[PDB]
């Protein structure tokens, strides 16, 4: 029809939560009978190329075609596309890649020219393009995208929003939620990220979850894309992230969704029951000097999670639906990789502290007593993992040093200068990582970071060689304990991956992750903390921000060293001991005890998350069997 | 006359070294017979209050009145003021304090209104006000300045330049030298700083030096002002800088001016024979990626020094005239104090490296062989002091630790937990100083720096207490050596100060300096190095700058630790030793040997500079006796 034959345009000019009273309308509401939309898809693209958006949008229409092809369903059928809308928010006309605009206009999504920057002495906060397309893309080559319109293609109700300035994504989502979502009032709103291709039936699988009324938030698995013929896995930096994604989705998502709280809905792919997130959630998500109030913006997405679980007089829960997945890409060079993880570490850490500091809010929600108890246990366990990850640094170095010294002492042959050399390499690498993080930037000095990761890698190889060497000699003759613990944790990893029915990561892309683990402990952490926050009031916030940043780093480093001093007897406590007896030995029983403790704890964590995986999978199997 | 009755104004609009061909003139050249100026005084003021400029300007006219009152002189007499000009360059109309403009216009130096920002579509690089005043100020109260015009006041040929923008002072001096000084061609140009009051006869004393033709550069003493009734000395931060100024001027100026090269002409008060500095000196001073070429701007003033000594086929020398002094003020709070010394440490360090790297240029100058040899020895000695100051940090901590441990070991009573506590305080203070320097700013966290200086102070008190305690017990029963060395260095300091005939600093303001010395080693250094330097080409320089900054800090810290490890046997070398014998002791003979070495060297340095002071004073006395 005409709306499918022409693309309407409009100029928004008001604060996002004002659209309703501002008398701004949309086509969905202007039909003779209003179209009751069931679902909204939000795509955020910043400067993405046409190919990336093409991947994501192909996933979109493939899903919608599948839903329209469904026969036995009350919600869907031949006209199912009517209840669907895809909102594409882009940030800033200047930064958006016209290379992508070519594809958009190729769809009839966009036409240029009718965009006066301001009207009636009033600038247009953002531009909006309204259309429902009938053409669909069928193939995406490495540089070419195939657009075809046949009797098999299906309609899509697009809605292209374009802001005109740099707004940190916290703004984009505002327009999505407090703006359009207030007008259309969809039941379900799903967030993607440009360049993330949903699975061909991922969307429907995820949607099926919201049959259960209590469900308020859900997500799916996230898979690193491997391109043509897995050609990317040969790189050790893409492969390592693949493995990490896969273990995270297998273990932590299932274990947490057992209880009901899922820590971070992947912003790559997530979905929210609109009614549940209305009111308090968006308010604390958008509007927040005191610590929590002025810092929570670094835990942007994960806050919503918390509050939706803890909503007063309300019993919303969160679920991880294993049957839906989205395939995305990961950085290839170390610099931008570090500039990525510097965001997740802080986000998770601040959400962790904030949640645990406000756990008592859970009991004042509407959940049942048993569910409330389970949530409390989950929060305590989660806080426990934050505590362990905070003592990552000292734990790693201490394990390293104790193992190295013990082997050289035990055999005296040549592991000796190896002990000293490796200690010095550790010191230089850690110190240099500090100063480069604090003063410099990652992208300026790529070559050194590449060297840093390599040095830590060979350190891990050496550690492993010593570990196996002592194990072998001892068995030929705590180390029986270490071989037990490591064999156990590896076996548990394997059996869990098999149960989940994706074991092809346990052997393909495992060694890369093991060799990168030191870089995940001593580089990502250091750079993460060193860039916490990245006269007039502005400088006053800046002074406060610097205060917090340079206070957290001090506490972190000092406390880790406290542990190192207590165990290794560094910091002159050992001297104080010897001279107290006067009124120093090499290593004490403390080293053996602590060394056992760290591996004991690691095996404990693996076992618990394994149980979580088993329970979640079993429950899904039983409900499927009954269904 | 009319020029004394009216103030002429003009709008400069050309690069500073273009004034001559640009057909821009000055009154001094427009008289029926050109006035052969003998001397130019340059005053730079940035945002100084009227009082500070009043102090400096009072010093100025008092000196000129004294010269005009001279009777037996070929150069001066009743009309001596004719050969004098005072150029007052201020930077930026926006930043200059109108509170000072009130005084300036009170003198008829400035009138507002005739200052079109641009003319003929050409902006005025800077504005210039020409006048010769007859009134003089007679008194400067704490808030009021007394301007009187009587038969005793004397004419002053002022010349008020005003730029319109932030230009780092390297620009101001350009206009002084390559601009006006090229027109007037004075014999002698003297640089002050606003707020620095020359001594009532300091200028004439300094001028008398340029009787000797070879002299190219000279300066005088710099005295911290003490205000009314020395009321400032009670503060321990003004007092400490007073003492440091006084020792520096007594020892280093005299010793260096013995040879001929004076490292840094105090920009507060200095004087240059114009002819000598023409050509190469200004060129390398103004116009300079490779290290030296792109970094020398941090040694701005001291470069000229070097080149003027090393000018090819020319035998210019530098002299320190003790008979001339200038009294200035010093910062009172720790923040701006640190932001001051962060400039001198880098300036001296870069000039030191640059000079010593180019010492071979001296022999290709015009000096005699004996003078060339003396200059070479002076350069080597100076480079030696840079080397010692670079190992300041490890030397201080190592002395501290060795002394503390030895005393607690020797007596076991309670110095024990004192050893551990103080070690921990040192670690925390140093680490925190690093991170606050690198990430934060001084002014943001004043309170912590005040705490830092205090903690280091009590550490020094403790060190001293242990030192005297061991000395006392040993004498009742290397430490005989330490008491010898410290008694020697203190005695040499005293005798030198007496010889110079200003001993009233040795007892008034000594304890403050001693207690602040740790802050001079572990805080000023750290912050100095951590702020070395403070797509498009601009970001490319920035990347290079960050590279150099974060490389120098690494080398400094690593090398200092190399020394600490070798001496104290830290870094596991001690472990390697014990386990080598296997195939650790507390302290070795290394500690005693090095401990003796540091004090031995300190006594050596004091003795040498003492000899320098004695020779300079003796030579001045003998020449005065003959004169
Ligand atoms: C204490 C807690 C401090 C916490 C603060 C900071 C946390 C980090 C602590 C690192 C490890 C310190 C280990 C330690 O006990 O100190 C060592 C020495 O003393 C030092 O080396 C002190 C180093 C302080 C560093 C402060 C930050 C600036 C680093 C850059 C500074 C510039 C570079 C130069 C730095 C010297 C221990 O030496 P030792 O083993 O006793 O030696 C004798 C051994 N023997 C008896 C077997 C013969
Ligand atoms: C080596 C050269 C490295 C040069 C690099 C850096 C220069 C600065 C060196 C400081 C002094 C180190 C002293 C040293 O030898 O290491 C100590 C331990 O190991 C450490 O403590 C290593 C500390 C490395 C710091 C790197 C920068 C990051 C600091 C923040 C990092 C996060 C905070 C936590 C840090 C752990 C020596 O311990 P020990 O005395 O052998 O203990 C047994 C004593 N016993 C036998 C008597 C029982
Ligand atoms: O100004 C911004 C910042 C972020 N993003 C979104 O966040 C991504 C950049 O972050 P990245 O993909 O590396 O990981 P994320 O930070 O989302 O975890 C972009 O591709 C967008 O999906 C955006 O669109 N605009
Ligand atoms: O933009 C500037 C920078 C510096 N100065 C001069 O340098 C002083 C500031 O430095 P300070 O006096 O603290 O010591 P200096 O840096 O000269 O050693 C000012 O008072 C001026 O004399 C100036 O006039 N303008
Ligand atoms: Mg991405
Ligand atoms: Mg990315
Ligand atoms: Mg000053
Ligand atoms: Mg100053």
Curated annotation (Swiss-Prot), chains A, B:
Molecular function terms from GO: chitin synthase activity
Subcellular location: Cell membrane
Transmembrane segments: 379-399, 417-437, 450-470, 482-502, 510-530, 551-571, 598-618
Regulation: Requires proteolytic activation.
Keywords: Cell membrane, Cell wall biogenesis/degradation, Glycosyltransferase, Membrane, Phosphoprotein, Transferase, Transmembrane, Transmembrane helix
Keyword check for Transmembrane helix: yes
Gene deletion effect: Cell lysis during cytokinesis.
One record GO biological process: chitin biosynthetic process
Enzyme Commission number(s) from the entry: 2.4.1.16
Membrane topology: Multi-pass membrane protein
Catalyzed reaction equations: [(1->4)-N-acetyl-beta-D-glucosaminyl](n) + UDP-N-acetyl-alpha-D-glucosamine = [(1->4)-N-acetyl-beta-D-glucosaminyl](n+1) + UDP + H(+)
Primary location class: membrane
Superkingdom of the organism of origin: Eukaryota
Single GO cellular component term: cell periphery
Entry's family note: Belongs to the chitin synthase family.
Role summary: Polymerizes chitin, a structural polymer of the cell wall and septum, by transferring the sugar moiety of UDP-GlcNAc to the non-reducing end of the growing chitin polymer. Required for mitotic division septum formation during adverse conditions.
The name this protein goes by in its record: Chitin synthase 1
Natural source organism: Saccharomyces cerevisiae (strain ATCC 204508 / S288c)
Organism lineage string: Eukaryota, Fungi, Dikarya, Ascomycota, Saccharomycotina
Gene: CHS1
């Amino acid at each position: 029809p005409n709306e499918f034959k022409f693309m309407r345009y409009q100029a928004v000019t008001c604060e996002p939560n004002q659209l309703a009273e501002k008398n701004f309308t949309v086509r969905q509401l202007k039909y003779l009978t209003p179209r009751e939309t069931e679902l909204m898809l939000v795509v955020t693209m910043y400067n993405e190329d046409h190919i990336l958006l093409g991947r994501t949008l192909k996933g979109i229409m493939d899903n919608v075609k599948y839903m329209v092809k469904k026969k036995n369903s009350s919600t869907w059928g031949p006209d199912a596309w009517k209840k669907i809308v895809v909102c594409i928010i882009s940030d800033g006309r200047s930064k958006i890649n016209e290379r992508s605009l070519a594809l958009l206009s190729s769809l009839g999504c966009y036409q240029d020219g009718f965009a006066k920057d301001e009207i009636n002495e009033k600038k247009v906060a953002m531009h909006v393009y309204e259309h429902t397309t009938m053409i669909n893309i069928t193939n995406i080559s490495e540089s070419e995208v195939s657009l075809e319109c046949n009797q098999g293609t299906v309609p899509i109700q697009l809605l292209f929003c374009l802001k005109e300035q740099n707004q940190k994504k916290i703004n984009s989502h505002r327009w999505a939620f407090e703006g359009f979502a207030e007008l259309l009032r969809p039941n379900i709103v799903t967030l993607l990220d440009a360049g993330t291709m949903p699975g061909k039936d991922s969307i429907y699988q995820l949607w099926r979850e919201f049959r259960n009324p209590n469900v308020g938030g859900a997500c799916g698995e996230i898979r690193t894309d491997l391109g043509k013929r897995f050609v990317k896995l040969l790189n050790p930096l893409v492969a390592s992230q693949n493995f990490e994604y896969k273990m995270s989705n297998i273990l932590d998502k299932t274990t947490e969704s057992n209880f009901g709280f899922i820590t971070v809905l992947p912003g790559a792919f997530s979905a929210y029951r609109f009614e549940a997130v209305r009111g308090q959630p968006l308010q604390k998500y958008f509007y927040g000097f005191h610590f929590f109030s002025s810092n929570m913006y670094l835990a942007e997405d994960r806050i919503l999670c918390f509050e939706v679980v803890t909503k007063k007089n309300c019993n919303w829960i969160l679920k991880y639906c294993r049957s839906s997945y989205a395939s995305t890409d990961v950085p290839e060079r170390v610099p931008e990789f570090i500039l990525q993880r510097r965001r997740w570490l802080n986000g998770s850490f601040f959400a962790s502290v904030y949640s645990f500091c406000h756990f008592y809010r859970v009991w004042s929600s509407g959940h049942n007593i048993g569910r409330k108890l389970l949530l409390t246990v989950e929060f305590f366990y989660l806080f426990f993992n934050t505590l362990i990850s905070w003592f990552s640094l000292s734990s790693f170095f201490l394990v390293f040093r104790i193992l190295t010294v013990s082997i050289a002492l035990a055999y005296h042959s040549a592991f000796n200068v190896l002990s000293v050399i490796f200690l010095w390499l550790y010191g230089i690498c850690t110190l240099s990582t500090f100063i480069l993080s604090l003063g410099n930037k990652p992208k300026s000095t790529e070559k050194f970071y590449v060297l840093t990761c390599v040095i830590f890698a060979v350190m891990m190889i050496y550690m492993i060689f010593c570990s196996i060497f002592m194990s072998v000699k001892s068995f030929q003759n705590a180390f029986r304990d270490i071989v037990i613990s490591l064999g156990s944790t590896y076996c548990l990893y394997l059996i869990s991956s098999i149960i989940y029915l994706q074991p092809w990561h346990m052997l393909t892309s495992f060694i890369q992750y093991i060799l990168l683990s030191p870089s995940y402990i001593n580089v990502l952490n250091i750079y993460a903390f060193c860039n916490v926050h990245d006269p007039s009031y502005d400088e006053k916030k800046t002074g406060y921000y610097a205060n917090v940043r340079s206070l957290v780093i001090i506490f972190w480093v000092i406390t880790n060293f406290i542990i190192v001093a207590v165990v290794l007897e560094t910091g002159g406590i050992a001297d104080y001991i010897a001279m107290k007896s006067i009124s120093i030995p090499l290593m004490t029983s403390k080293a053996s005890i602590y060394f056992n403790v760290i591996l004991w704890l690691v095996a404990l964590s693996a076992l618990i998350r394994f149980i979580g995986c088993s329970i979640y999978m079993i429950v899904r199997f039983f409900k499927k069997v009954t269904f």
